[PDB]
UniProtKB/Swiss-Prot annotation, chains A, B:
Protein's name according to its UniProt entry: Cysteine desulfurase
Localisation: Cytoplasm
Regulation: Displays a strong preference for selenocysteine as a substrate in vitro and is only very slightly active using cysteine. The interactions with SufE and the SufBCD complex act synergistically to enhance, up to 50-fold, its cysteine desulfurase activity.
Gene: sufS
One GO CC term on file: cytoplasm
Length: 405, 405
């Protein structure tokens, strides 16, 4: 079992005070706080082992290179990839999707083809595909939403045809907390010879993830949502696909040879896609974040977050004129609006109480438009949040309503 | 004046022991060690102020956004840009050059045009241009080298014609320590209506840099060479050029609006080129690194490094069969080979003595080929290195020669 008080003791920011009051950080879906184990693993590397990492001959550089490749191995096990060499280090989910969209997309999506996304996608999983369709003259198709925040799976037969090259789909919605039936959708997409890219940015911190069981072709996520440092993410690609993809960024450490008269040749893949000095510090911290989460147990995290969410949804029933968006089995986030008040104002009052929620469109304008609102509030309920923080949120919404209604 | 002992006291790695002996780190040109002020500024941010930075309504996110934009302002002053909004945050010099090569290059270099580089360029300032020339059908032209490691400036009239769109040139060579006459070359390139991108990765830590005086159109460099964290760099672009460039990576925080039926529109520039969550931690550390360097004074650093280099070059005269590459006024690095011994072996012995140098091709194979060697050794002489470390290097080369000759 799980001791939230012991967990919270690892997170130095949680004792912070905001606006003179004790912080209730309910915005982990935008970015997560980090434990000391993560912060200090990075600092300790800079303090005692720092060096360039391009298998330098001297000791510090040789040892730094090995730490980085160990983190790649650890990450591959975390998501149950077959091979470490199926993981590419990227700046985050966003860079990973752009890398796929340019490297794989440009040599596999021709004029007259189509790509499928869903209407709940984060902008990171829309814009790169809009750009690709514009480059090659293909069509972007959209799986629409039901009112409860789930996909209209019955439209798939009209969207999938033999010219469908790619399904790009979110694992868990950053707004609705909907979890999509990836395994079945992937089976369907493969029947048509389409690849599937899964945006897993909101999944990998809530429960185990197994890319072999999913059979997805690409999977991406971000360190900083996984209680880890900024500037680092993971792109996973099936080995057979990755060995075929051409390079995207060019430069050092991704070449085999550079000639000004005979041209340049590329190195093997995963390193073919990592040009220049990596974010070695972030890679170290990411490794520590994976160890920390693994040590708690993703199934113990899932069980605690489930209880916290069930508690919050029941307590929120006592808020007048509250509107919720999404299914009842949501993971992680609660999206809502309060009566007719604009989300911007609700969030400002909540901030004035020391409660940090996110307001706005959440990098999901098509989702906002489907619900015919311009913005929502979103409270994140993460592994280090408490029943008392849920109570502060409920009281807050009540006072905001009494005062502004 | 300058106290190297006081400086060294800020760098916790410098007291490390390698192979049982006290480390002499002479590989700063590959990556620099970081002071406590930099390491702790990052850790302190994670410990007390961490949040997502997309001008969130709540306090931590609002304050984080302001810290990041202050670092952008500080960086713009460090290089004397006219405006903070002329700086783009990138993963490093390599990403910055690829960003220019795709965003500006694709809409300004047409089939039949030419681009000019030099023969001493780092791969980061070659491969992206090779890729661009292949995409659009243009020609890559090369300024050749003199034996002393300087550019053959007399060939410029045969390389610059009216179809020359871009000069991409290094400020200071990462191998030879040659400093190129940028101001005059830029004047010439502008006479033909060509833009100039300057690779400044090896310049910004050795002396003041003034992009207004240079009048370069693009300037790039890396945090981790500037005593700062990994995963962060700066791309500077003249405002009038930058306002015209289309986006490269697509996603959140670089859009103005996203529509699945009316398409997507972009935000203003610098933010148009920063998709997804930035490396907020690295940006904080970069700011601290700039403050640290500014506090020492780049002119005091330049003067101390000059003396250290003059001392090393004189002491190295007493090494038999030493071959040096580059001009006598080199900044920062000494490239050499020892008699007929392969650089790999020289570096291994030096590492066994606790002296960290870099051996190999230094991401400059065309440079290696001009000198008809496969590899070199390179010792970096940075602001925190000492006469005694120079003496250890000289003795080492001598013993390596006696033992292996
Ligand atoms: C001259 C030069 N250009 C480019 C680079 C590569 O920059 P980075 O690896 O930080 O992306 C280096 C290092 C360098 O010394
Ligand atoms: C579902 C989803 N996709 C993409 C992103 C963006 O990833 P990043 O900003 O770390 O690049 C986020 C955050 C997200 O929640």
């Amino acid at each position: 079992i799980f001791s939230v008080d012991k967990v919270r003791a690892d997170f130095p920011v949680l004792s912070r005070e905001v606006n003179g009051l004790p912080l209730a950080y309910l915005d982990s879906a935008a970015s997560a706080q980090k434990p000391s184990q993560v912060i200090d693993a990075e600092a300790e590397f800079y303090r005692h082992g720092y060096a360039a990492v391009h298998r330098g001959i001297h000791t510090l550089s040789a040892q730094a290179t090995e730490k980085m490749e160990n983190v790649r191995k650890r990450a591959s096990l975390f998501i149950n990839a077959r091979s470490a060499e199926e993981l590419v280090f990227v700046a985050g989910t966003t860079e990973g999707i752009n890398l796929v969209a340019n490297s794989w997309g440009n040599s596999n999506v021709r004029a007259g083809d189509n790509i499928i996304i869903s209407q709940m996608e984060h902008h990171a999983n829309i814009v790169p595909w809009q750009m690709l369709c514009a480059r090659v003259g293909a069509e972007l198709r959209v799986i629409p939403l039901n009112p409860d925040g789930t996909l209209q799976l019955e439209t798939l037969p009209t969207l999938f045809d033999e010219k469908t090259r790619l399904l790009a789909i979110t694992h868990v919605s950053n707004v609705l907390g909907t979890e999509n039936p990836l395994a079945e959708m992937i089976t369907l997409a493969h029947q048509h010879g389409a690849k599937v890219l899964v945006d897993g940015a909101q999944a990998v911190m809530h429960h185990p993830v197994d890319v072999q069981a999913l059979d997805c072709d690409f999977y991406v996520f971000s360190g900083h949502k996984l209680y880890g440092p900024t500037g680092i993410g993971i792109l996973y690609v099936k080995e057979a696909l990755l060995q075929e993809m051409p390079p995207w960024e060019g430069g050092g450490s991704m070449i085999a040879t550079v000639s000004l008269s005979e041209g340049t040749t590329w190195t093997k893949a995963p390193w073919r896609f990592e040009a220049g000095t990596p974010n070695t510090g972030g890679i170290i911290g990411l490794g520590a974040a994976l160890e920390y989460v693994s040590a708690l147990g993703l199934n113990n995290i899932a069980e605690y977050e489930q209880n916290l969410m069930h508690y919050a949804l029941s307590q929120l029933e006592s808020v007048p004129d509250l509107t919720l968006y999404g299914p009842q089995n949501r993971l992680g986030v609660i999206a809502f609006n309060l009566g007719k008040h604009h989300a911007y104002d609700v969030g400002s009052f909540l901030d004035n109480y020391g409660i940090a929620v996110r307001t706005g469109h959440h990098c999901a304008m098509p989702l906002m438009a489907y619900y015919n609102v311009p913005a929502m509030c979103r409270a994140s309920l993460a592994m280090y949040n408490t029943h008392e923080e849920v109570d502060r949120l409920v009281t807050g919404l009540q006072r905001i309503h009494r005062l502004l209604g």
